[PDB]
Design an enzyme around this catalytic site. Structure first.
Site, PDB file in Angstrom:
ATOM      1  N   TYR A  93      22.488   1.579  68.590  1.00 33.70           N
ATOM      2  CA  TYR A  93      21.518   1.239  67.569  1.00 33.70           C
ATOM      3  C   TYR A  93      21.480   2.249  66.423  1.00 33.70           C
ATOM      4  CZ  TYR A  93      19.920  -2.530  70.597  1.00 33.70           C
ATOM      5  OH  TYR A  93      19.855  -3.670  71.361  1.00 33.70           O
ATOM      6  N   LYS A 232       4.951   0.229  54.249  1.00 38.26           N
ATOM      7  CA  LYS A 232       5.854   1.220  53.657  1.00 38.26           C
ATOM      8  C   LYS A 232       6.686   0.651  52.502  1.00 38.26           C
ATOM      9  CE  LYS A 232      10.322   0.864  56.033  1.00 38.26           C
ATOM     10  NZ  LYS A 232      11.026   0.604  54.733  1.00 38.26           N
TER      11      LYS A 232
END
Ligand SMILES: [Mg+2]
Ligand SMILES: [Mg+2]
Ligand SMILES: [Mg+2]
Lengths: 354, 354
Positions: A93, A232
Site C-alpha cells: 500500500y 482537508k
C-alpha cells in the site's frame, strides 16, 4: 460554499459512527505499538535497499511520511491479521500511495506491457518492476481467489493514476465518469480481499461471505475515505479531481448537492454493511467490524486529515452532534493518538545511507 | 422458472428501441456478408488447429454456435474497424463466450497464477493458456492505454465467471452485490476500448474522449444485454444468476421492479451518451453510433437470444407494444437476418479434421 459545512459535516460523521457501532476494542495501545513498529521496521528496511532506492522515484521526506501513514492505516484496520501480514501489506500500500507522486506519462513504458509480461521479462516501468517483484510476499498470505482480487485491483490502480495525470473531472453530462474513476484508483478489491489471510480463513468455505465483503467493502471504504478527506481538500486548490468535485463537474450540481450524494451513499453503505454481516459467521463479522472502526480511527488520528482542527473548534459547544463528535474523537485519540517516536524509527533515509 | 413476463418484456424493449431510435444503416447487404465471411474464416482456421482443438474443452456444436454468434456481434457492432481487427476480436470474444456459458472450477489451476505469470511459464488453466498466447494478435491493433483496458477487463471477466460457478445471487440486503458482479463479468472496458484501433484513432489525441466513452459505454452495453437477453436467460440453468434476478434477491424487490429499474438506468445511459458525445469529434460519435444500433440489431437477429420465439407469439397479439416490437424486429431482420450458408463455412469441425 464559502465556509466549511461544519454542522452538516458533524451530523453525517456522528451518524456514520453510530451506524457502524464505533466503539472500544480489545486492541490495546501496547499492541498497537508492537504492530506499528513491526510493520514500519520491515518496510523501512525494504525501502532502504539500494535497488528500491534507485528505481523508486520519491522525495525521501514524502516517502517517510507516506510509509508512516500507510503503516498506521494497515495496523489499525487489519487488526486480526499477523504481524508479517501487516508488514507486507504495508509495503504494498506504500508502493501504491507513492505512485501518485509520478507525473511521468506511462505510455512509453506501457507499449510492450503484455509482451514483456507474457514472456517473463522485467517491466519497463520501474514501478511495475519493483511491485511485481515484491508481490509474492503479499500474495503468500492468501488463497488463489483473494490473490486474483489483489492483482486486479492493483492493475486497476495503475490505470487510475494514468487517467489522473490528465487532471480530468469528467465531461459535463458524463454521469458515469466520477464513480468509474473512483473505483479505478480506489483499491477496493485489493483492500476487501486482503482482509482474509488463508491462515485464518478458508476462501472456499467462506466464498460467499468473502465475495460479498469485497463487493460491499469496496464502496464503503472509498466513500468513507472521501468523506473524511472532504475537510482537508475543501480549500486546497491543488486537489482538483475528487469524487465530490467530479460529481459537481460531471453531474452539473452544486458542491453541496455533491456532498449530499456522498453522505447518503456512505450512510446507506454503512447500514447495509451491518444489516448483512451481523448474523453471518462471527470471525468474519469481527474482521469486518474491526476494519471499519480502525479505518475511522486512523482518519481521526492521522494529521493528514487535520480533523483535530474540527475537534478544537466545536470542542466547547452544547449542541448534540458537536458533543457526540468530540466523545468519539476522544475515544479514538485514546487508543489511536500515538507519537511516531514510539515506533517509526529510524528514518528510512538513515537505513539507506548505511 | 415461473412465467416469462412477456407483457413487460415488450413494454421495456419497446421503450428502449424507441428512445434510441433504433436504425441500423451500418452496412449494405454485400458489405455485411463480406465482413462476416472474412471474420469467420480467420477465426474458424484458428480454432481448428490441433492445439486449440485440444486445450479448449467445448462440444464442437457449441463452439460452432458461439463462433457464429460472435463473428456476428463483432461485425455488426464494430462497423468502422478493419477486417483484420474484426477477425482477431472475433477470436478473443469467442474465447470469452465459451467460458461465459461454461461450468468449471478455476481454483485448482489458479493457485500458481501470479508466480507462473511473473516467471513467463504457461498458465495452468488451459483457457488462460490459449487466451494469453493469442492476445498479441488482438493488442497489436491498439495503443498501450486501450490495451491495458482490454487486459484488465478480460481478467475481471474471468473472476466474474468464477463467482458465478457458486450460483450466489447476493445476501438479501447486499445492495452493492448485483452491479458489482455485472461489471465484473460484463467486459465493459474490453468492449469499449476495443472500439478504437490505433490505425484509425490516436489514443493520445483522444485520450479524454476514449476514457469517457469507456466509462459510459460500460453500462449502456451491459444493461442493454441484460434487457435483450432477459428472455434467453430467464429459464436457463446457467443464467439464473443475472443482474435482474440478483436485483430481486439482493434488493428484495419484485421481478417487475427489477426490470423497471434496469430500463430506467438504460434510458438515462442512452440520454447521456447523446448529451456528451453529440457535439464531440464526429469520428468518435460515428463509432459510438454504429456500435449502439448494430449491437441492437445483433441481439434481435442472433440465435443465442432466441428473440424470434417472442416474435412468433405476439405477431398475432393486437397489443400496442406487441405491434411496436414486431415492427422493430422486422426492421432489424431486413438488415441483420442473413443466412449462415452465405458466410459461415466450412464448419470448424471440418477444418479440424483436415
Ligand atoms: Mg456472465
Ligand atoms: Mg452470459
Ligand atoms: Mg445477459
Amino acid at each position: 460554499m464559502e465556509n466549511f459545512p461544519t454542522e452538516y459535516f458533524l451530523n453525517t460523521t456522528v451518524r456514520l459512527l453510530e451506524y457502524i457501532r464505533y466503539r472500544d476494542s480489545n486492541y490495546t495501545r501496547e499492541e498497537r505499538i508492537e504492530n506499528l513498529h513491526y510493520a514500519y521496521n520491515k518496510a523501512a528496511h525494504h525501502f532502504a535497499q539500494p535497488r528500491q532506492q534507485q528505481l523508486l522515484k520519491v522525495d525521501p521526506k514524502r516517502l517517510q511520511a507516506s510509509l508512516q501513514t500507510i503503516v498506521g492505516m494497515v495496523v489499525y484496520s487489519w487488526a486480526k491479521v499477523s504481524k508479517e501480514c501487516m508488514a507486507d501489506l504495508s509495503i504494498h500500500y506504500t508502493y501504491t500511495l507513492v505512485l501518485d507522486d509520478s507525473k511521468d506519462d506511462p505510455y512509453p513504458t506501457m507499449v510492450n506491457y503484455f509482451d514483456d509480461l507474457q514472456a517473463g521479462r522485467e517491466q519497463a516501468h520501474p514501478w511495475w518492476a519493483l511491485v511485481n517483484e515484491h508481490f509474492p510476499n503479499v500474495l503468500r498470505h492468501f488463497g488463489p481467489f483473494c490473490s486474483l482480487n489483489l492483482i486486479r485491483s492493483t492493475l486497476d490502480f495503475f490505470e487510475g493514476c494514468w487517467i489522473e495525470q490528465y487532471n480530468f473531472g469528467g465531461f459535463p453530462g458524463s454521469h458515469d465518469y466520477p464513480q468509474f474513476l473512483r473505483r479505478m484508483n480506489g483499491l477496493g478489491h485489493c483492500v476487501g480481499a486482503s482482509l482474509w489471510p488463508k491462515e485464518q480463513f478458508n476462501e472456499r468455505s467462506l466464498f460467499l461471505e468473502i465475495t460479498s465483503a469485497i463487493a460491499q467493502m469496496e464502496n464503503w471504504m472509498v466513500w468513507v475515505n472521501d468523506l473524511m478527506s472532504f475537510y482537508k481538500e475543501f480549500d486546497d486548490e491543488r486537489d482538483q479531481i475528487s469524487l465530490v468535485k467530479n460529481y459537481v463537474v460531471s453531474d452539473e450540481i452544486s458542491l453541496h448537492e455533491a456532498l449530499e450524494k456522498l453522505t447518503q451513499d456512505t450512510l446507506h453503505s454503512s447500514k447495509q454493511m451491518v444489516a448483512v454481516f451481523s448474523d453471518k459467521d462471527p470471525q468474519v463479522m469481527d474482521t469486518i467490524e474491526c476494519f471499519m472502526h480502525g479505518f475511522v480511527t486512523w482518519h481521526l488520528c492521522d494529521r493528514r486529515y487535520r480533523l483535530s482542527e474540527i475537534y478544537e473548534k466545536v470542542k466547547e459547544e452544547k449542541t448534540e452532534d458537536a458533543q457526540k463528535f468530540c466523545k468519539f474523537y476522544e475515544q479514538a485519540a485514546n487508543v489511536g493518538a500515538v507519537s511516531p517516536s514510539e515506533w517509526a524509527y529510524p528514518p528510512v533515509a538513515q537505513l539507506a545511507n548505511v
